[PDB]
Design a protein around this ligand. Structure first.
Ligand SMILES: O=C(N1CCCCC1)N1CCCCC1
Ligand SMILES: O=C(N1CCCCC1)N1CCCCC1
Lengths: 169, 169
């Protein structure tokens, strides 16, 4: 009871691009959007998310901690104060703590990305929401429906519990 | 007609780590191993692949072109001339060609990571074969059996057709 389609960028034998399919999923959302992403600088996908939030959709966004200031800078350059949108909550996730060769204390990255809409559909894969994924790289995603969506829901809730208010806020 | 399980690193309720499951999948290979990977520097996984090849398994490895020298540096440190193992073929894959504002022509990366064994089982996800994914980062994979495996086989063949002999070789 799980169904899976594959999409690629650049595209193959499918009608829509990965980015057009991301916009579609966000426009179709009626209740909740849950996003986990490492780098988020795409202005067009951000605008879709904000519009969803003005419609009354609750939006929860989990970003990798090291790269967060790239997202904040984009929203500021768009003249948005993302802090003030009540229907969106943005929080950061760190990787593991570790000691380097020299004994310094660092943390790694959250290498996870997926979009979960209305607890019924997931896009999961290697596509990051930034210009380099449009113009420079090859990538792929899965569009997932059915029972496996519950597992993504559970994982989102576990990451949300770990996540923190961004230090920049 | 597809079954999918999830594994995480650091590990959650499941018995084995991602790295232990990779070693397992390789040891269980009877005919063919097909691997697509962005960076490969983990010696223990490389030892497993070489041992599979000595028992007559055919091994096809596709590596992101921009990161290839990290692999080559590892195999040489280990005292292995990988280009002399006839049951292993290593080839590189480039991202898209694009032109920067300075005019110089560059290419991006292949952002794709999966292990396909005997045309029957796939490990797909965000885990790269390097020390940072053991000690520093949070990552996840899918373990896939059934009809979806066929789509991974098609994609492998498509990337293999695109791929090139590495310039060092
Ligand atoms: O409403 C949700 N969930 C439904 C959407 C997918 C999984 C998360 N959460 C978000 C995290 C704070 C607790 C409520
Ligand atoms: O025999 C294979 N395999 C590829 C797909 C998974 C296993 C079977 N190939 C490798 C790619 C070039 C031609 C032969």
């Amino acid at each position: 009871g799980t169904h899976i389609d594959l999409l690629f960028h650049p595209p193959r034998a499918h009608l829509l691009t990965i980015k057009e399919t991301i916009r579609k999923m966000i426009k179709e959302a009626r209740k909740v959007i849950a996003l986990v992403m490492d780098i988020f600088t795409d202005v067009d996908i951000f605008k879709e998310i904000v519009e969803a939030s003005t419609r009354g959709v609750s939006v929860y966004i989990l970003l990798d901690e090291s790269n967060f200031n790239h997202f904040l800078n984009m929203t500021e350059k768009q003249g948005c104060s993302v802090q003030r949108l009540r229907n969106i909550r943005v929080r950061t996730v760190k990787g593991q703590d570790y000691l380097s060769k020299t004994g310094a204390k660092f943390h790694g990255k959250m290498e996870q990305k997926f979009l979960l809409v209305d607890c019924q559909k997931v896009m999961y894969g290697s596509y990051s929401y930034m210009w380099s994924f449009e113009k420079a790289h090859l990538s792929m995603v899965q569009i997932i429906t059915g029972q496996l969506v519950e597992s993504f829901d559970e994982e989102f809730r576990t990451l949300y519990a770990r996540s923190c208010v961004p230090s920049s806020f």
